[PDB]
Design a protein around this ligand. Structure first.
Ligand SMILES: *Cc1ccc(S(=O)(=O)N(C)C2CCOCC2)cc1
Ligand SMILES: *Cc1ccc(S(=O)(=O)N(C)C2CCOCC2)cc1
Ligand SMILES: [Cl-]
Ligand SMILES: [Cl-]
Lengths: 9, 229, 229, 9
């Protein structure tokens, strides 16, 4: 189950 | 530690730190920028969130490796000792972020976009605490994550279109909370399905660039639903 | 900082830190193990080298990103300030490793395998200092790398077969020194070609597992020669 | 030009 990557932006 | 650096310089260095893949630095620069006391713009909020997600993402990945070795072990005290050290460092980063939100990003956030953004962050960082919690306060940690996500959800449904990327990412992460932390897979599936369907029905209103932004996160909802059903 | 931890526990935690991809921790555990004062075994030497190569590898990658932005810039002082901060941290890690070799890994290393290993490390860490050096001591830094690699080379040719992986990796790295630091591309090409050919002629002596070990590094020599010719 | 990776072993 994946959450928002949110590791670039 | 960053009190003698200009706010604008801290922001600039955070962007450079991202380019250099120096996420610990990036997080320290953005902590410094928050502690200047001004509200953050949309871009600055994203820099703060990216910095800490990367830092805590590495700690979580390491904790899961060590927890797995330790579960297969129970050798010596070393695997548990090292897992504990990593856990305490992860807890410290989550406490730092929660502290920034509490002092005083949330209380000053009056627009729906900023308030939803910070409450989603609060739910996420209590969720990371819950992943490693065992003892007297674990139920309370889970409820703290739940409460933050639920307030964000109530604001987002009232104030944002169903395709807004923050609203979509909040629902994605809240559905993960339900599935992985709350032992509520049916709530997780229902939330992801309803979020996906209500966004689909609103895509006609969007420009090409916004369409690309919303459909990216919709696909993450679909990937979860495929795994969970 | 690690003086109260057992040597064996430091070694165990370094291996766990590698599995968890926590290279800063890994380096601190292996520094602690070296400071116990005993010589290191072959495996322990590799743990020390892997830890520091990863740490300094990340710093070098970040320094090159920032140096590139700064060269396109010359805006504000921030890009130079941040490049300098990263540089000082990289220099500090290289000084730490060089200090471990000087106190007292090299002087206690009497077998050719250990002595060559540590002198190659010394050449490598002076080489990383040289990559960022500009001023009064830069020529001296380059000569310090050269001197360390040359002593290692003299021992390796006298005491190790041409297929020994340490001898091969030393020659690879010394050829990179010649090409990238010393402005001697012909010396680099000649060293890589002679190393490759002399290993090829010795492969017949090797077991299947050792054959795989030597041919892996030979292919790195071939990849460089392809780029340089 | 590549040196010994040396980042795992
Ligand atoms: C939780 C969250 C944060 C930020 C966004 S975003 O609008 O900036 N955006 C569309 C994301 C950027 C990173 O990749 C996924 C999308 C959305 C949700
Ligand atoms: C410089 C150096 C260090 C270690 C070796 S090794 O014998 O341990 N070995 C074969 C390498 C391991 C890492 O990948 C490349 C080969 C050789 C050279
Ligand atoms: Cl406000
Ligand atoms: Cl000895």
């Amino acid at each position: 189950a994946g959450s928002i990557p949110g590791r670039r932006s | 530690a960053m009190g003698s650096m200009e706010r604008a310089s801290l922001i600039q260095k955070a962007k450079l730190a991202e380019q250099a893949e120096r996420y610990e630095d990036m997080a320290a620069f953005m902590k410094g920028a928050v502690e200047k006391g001004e509200e953050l713009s949309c871009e600055e909020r994203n820099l703060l969130s990216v910095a800490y997600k990367n830092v805590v993402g590495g700690q979580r990945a390491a904790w899961r490796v060590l927890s797995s070795i330790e579960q297969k072990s129970n050798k010596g005290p070393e695997v548990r000792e090292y897992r504990e050290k990593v856990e305490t460092e992860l807890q410290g980063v989550c406490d730092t972020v929660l502290g920034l939100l509490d002092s005083h990003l949330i209380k000053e956030a009056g627009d729906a976009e900023s308030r939803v953004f910070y409450l989603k962050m609060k739910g996420d960082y209590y969720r990371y605490l819950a992943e490693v919690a065992t003892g007297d306060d674990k139920k309370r940690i889970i409820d703290s994550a739940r409460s933050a996500y639920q307030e964000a959800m109530d604001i987002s449904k009232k104030e944002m279109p169903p395709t807004n990327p923050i609203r979509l990412g909040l629902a994605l992460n809240f559905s993960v909370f339900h599935y992985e932390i709350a032992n509520s897979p049916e709530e997780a599936i229902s939330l992801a399905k309803t979020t996906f369907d209500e966004a689909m029905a609103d895509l006609h209103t969007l420009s090409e660039d916004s369409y690309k932004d919303s459909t990216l996160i919709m696909q993450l909802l679909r990937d979860n639903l495929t795994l969970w059903t």
